[PDB]
Design a binder for this molecule. Structure first.
Ligand code: SF4
Ligand code: SF4
Ligand code: SF4
Ligand code: SF4
Ligand code: FES
Ligand SMILES: [Cl-]
Ligand SMILES: [Mg+2]
Ligand SMILES: [Mg+2]
Ligand SMILES: [Mg+2]
Ligand SMILES: [Mg+2]
Length: 581
């Protein structure tokens, strides 16, 4: 037991925790900035969490454990003057121009500036931003006129991926954040997962914009612009319209997309059902041939980059099915003209993703056929919200509409893709039916769901027991491989997601402030929307999707062979040998 006094209030406690956590647990306001993910910036503490401890002086609450006898003051003039001073020193290195800024509505730094009425000693007003901006990547952008050097991106990359692809760099005697040797992120071991963006409290890290690609296509007379959103968008975008967390906004999105001028409203969940058709067929092929094993999923481009960069010997074990994004895109240039009369060259296919790595996937040289890209543009959840707001579309008051069905219907198995273990569960629902030539009623695989980092299960398919794993976050892939877990038993099918929680926690998603993250389990609440859709959909197996069945019957043929394999599959170039690299 300890006795603590905070702002005159005595507490008796046996907790072993920091001042900051104890105070917040007890409804005592203490500000913080660089603290996130249970880490602060050890080499450059922001000190926004400063408090006074009698007999010690000023201390950082976010990294100081409570101790018996402490008498703490969080709101004295001296404490508040120190905090204001720290914010002022940050304004000295910050281009404070919120009007056109992409974080204007949800910036953590602006909130602190306002709270403490802080002002720079000397305004930072660079007349030209070229030297501060890196837009080389297909997925990420850096604007160092906004960077606080808070280290939250560095810490978050370490925690989420263990790549440490985001680093502190010494650029002629000045500290910046960036990739190894100040290279373009894409040319390093970076996965392009954008977890560093999600951790950034300001507009310093962003997605590489595709909004101009999209607007130019919408305004081109002869382009027919398809749009299709990822599973997770419908569970997330409402947050950016003050609608709260866990709101299913599917119908409003379809309406908003029509109001933005898109010419066809499809859904990547249809592509999710296509990927299952192919992937479950491939798994059954491997089961009936008793190998090869394991098969890894290939639908998360952060994981694909992780394999290319660290485990290229596993590229030969990846499923060859394209991801829902790319498989949908391929079909949008082949099947869709065949049922519409559109000239394939005039089709422009746009996805809305919770993900920055998806932009790199869509821009891979070989992701095209006959000169036509599978996918022409990828906008994040954040970018779609901005497009809606710029168009003055009253999202929260829109009536619901439906997708155009031909490439827009989806089953409950497709619906769950955006949660960790969703691909696994969806794939098993079809694989078991295929292998057993049956229509099984027991389709829920709750043992692969949820936030555990490594989830294993034994499944019975056609009288044989098989082992599956769901790897939940890139750091957990490293743990599974480096610890030898892959060799502890024979795995047959392994799902890997780069973002912990699955795509509902992707790097293109709405930012959430640290206080809301403590109040709301964002990964669970966003995923709950998707599981709810599956629960109430009539068709809960990808192979029961009626639009999909017609597509295969009339155009692609049998999945997993022939035309479907020729067109809808992809093997990574780095799977084969080359030297040098
Ligand atoms: S990052 Fe925040 S404080 Fe800085 S200009 Fe943008 S909104 Fe304003
Ligand atoms: S890019 Fe963002 S998270 Fe990273 S140090 Fe700069 S302000 Fe902090
Ligand atoms: S995109 Fe992912 S791997 Fe690359 S620096 Fe950001 S968090 Fe690290
Ligand atoms: S888990 Fe989803 S959001 Fe994250 S990198 Fe992979 S595809 Fe993108
Ligand atoms: S929030 Fe405590 S040092 Fe930054
Ligand atoms: Cl249609
Ligand atoms: Mg620390
Ligand atoms: Mg220092
Ligand atoms: Mg148009
Ligand atoms: Mg193949």
């Amino acid at each position: 037991m300890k006795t603590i006094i905070i702002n005159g209030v005595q507490f008796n406690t046996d907790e072993d925790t920091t001042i900051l956590k104890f105070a917040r647990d007890n409804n005592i306001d203490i500000s913080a900035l660089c603290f996130l993910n249970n880490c602060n910036n050890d080499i450059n503490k922001c000190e926004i969490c400063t408090v006074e401890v009698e007999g010690t002086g000023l201390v950082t609450a976010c990294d100081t454990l409570i101790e018996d006898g402490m008498i703490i003051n969080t709101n004295s003039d001296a404490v508040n003057e120190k905090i204001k001073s720290r914010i002022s020193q940050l304004l000295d290195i910050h281009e404070f121009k919120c009007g056109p800024c992409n974080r204007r509505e949800n910036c953590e730094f602006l909130k602190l500036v306002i709270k403490y009425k802080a002002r720079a000693s000397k305004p930072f007003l660079p007349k030209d931003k070229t030297e501060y901006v890196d837009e080389r990547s297909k997925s990420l952008t850096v604007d160092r006129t906004k960077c606080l050097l808070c280290g939250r991106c560095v810490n978050a990359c370490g925690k989420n991926t263990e790549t440490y692809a985001m680093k502190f760099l010494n650029k002629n005697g000045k500290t910046i954040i960036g990739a190894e040797d100040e290279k373009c992120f894409d040319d390093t071991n970076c996965l392009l997962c954008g977890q560093c963006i999600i951790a950034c409290p300001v507009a310093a890290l962003s997605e590489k914009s595709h909004m101009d690609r999209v607007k130019n296509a919408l305004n081109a007379p002869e382009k027919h612009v398809i749009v299709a959103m990822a599973p997770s968008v419908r569970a997330s975008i409402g947050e950016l319209f003050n609608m709260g967390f866990g709101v299913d906004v599917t119908g409003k999105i379809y309406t908003a997309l029509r109001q933005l001028g898109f010419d066809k409203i499809f859904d990547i969940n249809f592509g999710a059902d296509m990927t299952i058709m192919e992937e479950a067929t491939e798994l059954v092929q491997r089961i009936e041939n008793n190998g090869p094993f394991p098969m890894f999923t290939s639908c998360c481009p952060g994981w694909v980059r992780q394999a290319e960069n660290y485990y290229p010997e596993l590229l030969n074990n990846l499923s060859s099915a394209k991801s829902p994004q790319q498989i949908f895109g391929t079909a949008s240039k082949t099947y869709y003209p065949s049922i519409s009369g559109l000239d394939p060259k005039n089709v422009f296919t746009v996805t809305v993703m919770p993900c920055t790595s998806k932009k790199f996937e869509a821009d891979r040289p070989q992701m095209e056929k006959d000169g036509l890209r599978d996918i022409d543009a990828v906008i994040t959840t954040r970018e779609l919200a901005k497009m809606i707001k710029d168009a003055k579309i009253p999202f929260a008051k829109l009536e619901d509409s439906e997708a155009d069905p031909a490439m827009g219907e989806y089953s409950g198995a497709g619906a769950i893709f955006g949660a960790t273990g969703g691909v696994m569960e969806a794939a098993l629902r079809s694989a078991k039916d295929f292998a057993e030539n049956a229509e099984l009623e027991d389709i829920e695989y709750k043992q692969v769901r949820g936030l555990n980092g490594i989830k294993e299960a034994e499944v019975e398919i056609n009288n044989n027991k098989y082992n599956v794993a769901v790897i939940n976050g890139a750091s957990n892939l490293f743990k599974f491989m480096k610890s030898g877990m892959i060799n502890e038993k024979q795995y047959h099918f392994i799902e890997v997601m780069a973002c912990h929680g699955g795509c509902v926690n992707g790097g293109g998603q709405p930012h959430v402030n640290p206080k809301d993250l403590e109040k709301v389990d964002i990964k669970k609440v966003r995923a709950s929307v998707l599981y709810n859709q599956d629960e109430h959909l009539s068709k809960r197996k990808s192979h029961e999707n009626t639009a999909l069945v017609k597509m295969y019957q009339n155009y692609f043929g049998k999945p997993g062979e022939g035309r479907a394999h020729e067109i809808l599959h992809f093997k990574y170039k780095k799977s084969a040998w080359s030297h040098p690299q």
